[PDB]
Design a protein around this nucleic acid. Structure first.
Lengths: 77, 91, 112, 53, 151
RNA sequence: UUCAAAUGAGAACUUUGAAGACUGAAGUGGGGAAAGGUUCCACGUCAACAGCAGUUGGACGUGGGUUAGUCGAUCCUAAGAGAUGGGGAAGCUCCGUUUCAAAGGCCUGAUUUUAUGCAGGCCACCAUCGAAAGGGAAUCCGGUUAAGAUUCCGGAACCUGGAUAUGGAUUCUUCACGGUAACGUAACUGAAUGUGGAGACGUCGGCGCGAGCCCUGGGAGGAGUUAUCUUUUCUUCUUAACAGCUUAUCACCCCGGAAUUGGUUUAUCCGGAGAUGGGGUCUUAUGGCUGGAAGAGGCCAGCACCUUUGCUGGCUCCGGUGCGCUUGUGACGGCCCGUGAAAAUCCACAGGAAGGAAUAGUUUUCAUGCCAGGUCGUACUGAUAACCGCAGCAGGUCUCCAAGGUGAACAGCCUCUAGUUGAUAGAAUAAUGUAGAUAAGGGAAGUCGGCAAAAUAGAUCCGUAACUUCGGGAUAAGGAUUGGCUCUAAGGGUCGGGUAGUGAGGGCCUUGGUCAGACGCUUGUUGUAGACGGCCUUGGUCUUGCUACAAUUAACGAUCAACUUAGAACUGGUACGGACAAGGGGAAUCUGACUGUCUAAUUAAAACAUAGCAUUGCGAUGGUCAGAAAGUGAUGUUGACGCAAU
RNA sequence: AUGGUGAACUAUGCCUGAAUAGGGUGAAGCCAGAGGAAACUCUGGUGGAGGCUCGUAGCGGUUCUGACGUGCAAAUCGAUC
């Protein structure tokens, strides 16, 4: 579906009582004219749409991945 | 540079259709495709679309007229007859 | 160069059978059917296309929100600004002259 | 050259009409033709200043 | 199939709240947005339709009614008109000159629209090609080409 | 067409492998419409058919195979068909289909036996059928069978019908604000009735732009050649429906005001009914980034599995040009005594009925959530073997895609992808034949008649008469060149119009780190980088506003990639449109003016037709014509510049 | 003579769609220049018209009175059109 780029609202739709599954994807991409980095994508499967949240810095990944509720069945990689 | 001597627009028909028929056709197509002045805006923007319909490109004012002329000579006096006949009703 | 074929069952090219060839992810050239083009809505008075209104097929207009179907003017999605602007002039001035017609009539007949 | 500022608005129209026709054959053919037009304009302009004085 | 332009005149229904469109043969000299007036008290201008009994001598009209209510039968082609050549107040008749030169007397109550019909002088252009005849007759009827009976 | 192997009792024909060719992408290739009806695929098999043969088959016996809310039929209506009420007709039935028919349902309210009746506001359309290439609500990608897929598996969408809430906006200025404006903001009451838009749309010509393909540079891999040379040749490098942001001509809005008239398209239209200019709005075709989605597909290296198979892995990148072909679209211009469809359906506006506030009532044409999408078709051929021509018969049958080179070219000729290598064969290869050809000298003397063949026949330069309806005749007639190599000249785009102090050198790399400097290489051990990066620097760190010299001319300098034209030397046993491709010409006569049409299967014609000219009838209670009548029709959705007969 | 069937071929009209490489010639209209006192006339560009023209796809078929004429074919094949 579409893509949303806000952290705070993203957690709201995780426990929105309609999301059953979610997936996380890792990509090793390039940037600018320098050395590459670690890139990750967080995907959430809704009832009629497939939301996503791309993050190009693994620094913010830690505090978010722990914030996922245990009741959410996550397909790691 | 006058490219063609005497046939102009009707020269597109080649050599066929005689000389008088082309010439008589030639006369009408000159004013059929010509540019007329508009009575509502006064511009050189009156052209013929369809048989006897004269439209103005600007202000979209379409005037009904002759098949090949905005105002045919056989009917220019018709409104002159009516207009001269109107005033006797009042005075 | 790869060559494509029809996906529907009609073998003839018409306005309802327009074909655009697209580069498919699988590495092959696939024919993609295009729907007929939309036409701009037109003003009822001047006939010209009116701006600010979404252009789409007739039946599919039932899905778009009103923000693309109604400008905040009087005669929103039927007339276009200038036609409305002089429609106000024609309405205001003729009613203005109508009472002028009335006042002269009340004076001439009274002094008759 | 019209927006370059060196030329005037009126001389644009003269050459534009002629460029729609002939006697302008190529890019080079126009450039000194423009120059001599400015050179001619500068000729009487210099002579007009001294003649008045 | 008609050499004369039409006119789409809208008349507001007085009986009910709606609009009625009418198809009129465009008399030459009428334009879009012109106020076409129909009735007894209509003035004498090109485009208006009036009964023949309401107009003085010398007026030429078109699209007149054979009988009071057939809504126009006579002088409907391009460039045609019928002249008012005298009234008959007794027994409410009026006689006119048809475009063919025939003189016919009709009721003064039958209506007719003032002015000649646009599209006149059309047949002054030679038809030249066969295809121009084919194009002209492709919309009128199957009356072309004509084969001689002697052959 | 040939060779070898395999199978088989039995191979010029089956299969496989190796060669040699052809169709040359207006296919001998990929899909379909009508038609066929299981010919589709698998097993086994040769009595019969495949005009030779055959273990081969579109044949024989037995089985398998066609998956739809989105593709279509379903629905609308065109030309037209036709049922009622009616009128004829002995009658089978004929006329008309809205016309001499009192021909219908429909929202509010009543509610609380009213089930749905009843009391008012109402509108009147006025059977049905009729175009799987006319209009039409909604989806794509990857993969998967012996045979299926836009239908199945996976992933990702959107539409319609319905029910209910959650969230947001609205409100004691009870049914929103902003912008001068074009208009915008996800939502941001609203009936009867009326109006408007879409559906809805001619052909041709050039131009602009987009997509697919073609050409090509760098780099990352694989395959080919390598007697000699070639930073060489070929090949993979791809991204969908749908969604967010963003993006164009055209058009419009605010200021301003014009002659020393100016903008301006390849194509001269526009401007005091207000330009040029400055600043904005809008449709979003198309295009760009992102999500779908790189975990998908593709090209490669190792692992070993009689096997059922996979794992580990790398890349899947950055560009350029063009009168290039196909196609789409936009603003235009030319054409008409042709100006070049309807309805279903969908939406909007005017209007104001009706109801409504905050102790909350709406808001289900705002976001989200829940359910369902019925029936029918889906296999294959679509053609010198699946259709029609009694047959597997050189015949006929509608359409989309279409590469490289020479070349004006979808012409001819050769090739890449793909597909065939199929239509009886072997040996000598007499006459006579059918189809291609060549002939010394003359040359139409042959023949009813140069009938058949022949010659010129492409391109560039020169030159062209009689006559004429002045447009043509006319590439008339008639002359000069054409190869290859090395050069010369000409025809464009994009950038830059200074020095000294100054501010940012919004890259500020650089020295210190401050602390997001963190992931990455189960708590902790203590080990690694901090992604070397947000945040401040004493700085050497090619765009500039200010002043100065004086700022200007000559115009310059740097990059880039196309073909076209002309010319100069040299060179070839004077050959050069070298193959293919490709006009014989002139003086006249008879006749039809020309384009066009017909005897589909012996006559393509001076025959018919055509424009032009003239005549005749007709003013509708009519002229011409049809019907067995009719309350019937064709001209006629007509009117004398028209219809009808010549 | 009576009563029925046939326009899937072809004959004509209507509705609905579909198809037509590449060159030649050059009309209006327009622009510039020149001439002249005017009227106006010539020169050079665009421009694409034209039931025009050479010529493929397509439609017919002129000639060889070619081939065949118990044929591939109850009229087809090849060249020239």
């Amino acid at each position: 579906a579409r893509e949303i780029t806000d952290i705070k609202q993203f957690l709201e739709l995780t426990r929105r009582a309609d999301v059953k599954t979610a997936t996380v994807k890792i990509n090793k991409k390039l940037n600018k004219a320098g050395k590459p980095f670690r890139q990750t994508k967080f995907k959430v499967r809704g009832s009629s749409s497939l939301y996503t949240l791309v993050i190009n810095d693994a620094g913010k990944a830690k505090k978010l991945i722990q914030s996922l509720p245990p009741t959410l069945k996550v397909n790691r990689l | 540079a006058k490219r063609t001597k005497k046939v102009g627009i009707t020269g597109k028909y080649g050599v066929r259709y005689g000389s008088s028929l082309r010439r008589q056709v030639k006369k009408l197509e000159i004013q059929q495709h010509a540019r007329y002045d508009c009575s509502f805006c006064g511009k050189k923007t009156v052209k013929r679309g369809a048989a006897g319909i004269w439209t103005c490109s600007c202000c979209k004012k379409t005037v009904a007229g002759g098949a090949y002329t905005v105002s045919t000579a056989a009917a220019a006096t018709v409104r002159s007859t009516i207009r001269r006949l109107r005033e006797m009703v009042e005075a | 160069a790869q060559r494509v074929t029809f996906r529907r069952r009609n073998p003839y090219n018409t306005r309802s059978n327009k074909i655009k060839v697209v580069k498919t992810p699988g590495g092959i050239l696939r024919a993609q059917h295009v729907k007929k083009l939309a036409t701009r809505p037109k003003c009822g008075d001047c006939g010209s296309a009116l701006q600010g209104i979404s252009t789409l097929r007739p039946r599919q207009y039932a899905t778009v929100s009103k923000t693309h179907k109604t400008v905040s003017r009087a005669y929103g999605g039927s007339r276009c600004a200038n036609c409305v602007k002089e429609r106000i002039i024609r309405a205001f001035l003729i009613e203005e002259q109508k009472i002028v017609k009335k006042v002269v009539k009340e004076q001439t007949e009274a002094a008759k | 050259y019209r927006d370059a500022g060196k030329i005037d608005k009126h001389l644009y129209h003269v050459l534009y009409k002629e460029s729609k026709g002939n006697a302008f054959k190529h890019k080079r053919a126009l450039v000194e033709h423009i120059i001599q037009a400015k050179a001619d304009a500068q000729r009487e302009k210099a002579l007009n200043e001294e003649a008045e004085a | 199939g008609r050499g004369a332009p039409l006119a789409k005149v809208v008349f507001r229904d007085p009986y009910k709240y709606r609009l009625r469109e009418e198809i009129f043969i465009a008399n030459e000299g009428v334009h879009t947005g012109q106020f076409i007036y129909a009735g007894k008290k209509a003035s004498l201008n090109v485009g208006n339709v009036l009964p023949l009994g309401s107009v003085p001598e010398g007026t030429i009209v078109s699209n007149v009614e054979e009988k009071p209510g057939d809504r126009g039968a006579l002088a409907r082609a391009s460039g045609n008109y019928v002249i008012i050549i005298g009234h008959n107040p007794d027994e409410n008749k009026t006689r006119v000159r048809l475009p063919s030169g025939a003189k016919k007397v009709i009721s003064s109550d039958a209506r007719g629209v003032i002015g000649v019909i646009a599209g006149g002088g059309r047949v002054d252009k030679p038809l030249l090609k066969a295809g121009r005849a084919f194009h002209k007759y492709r919309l009128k009827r199957n009356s072309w080409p004509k084969t001689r009976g002697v052959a």
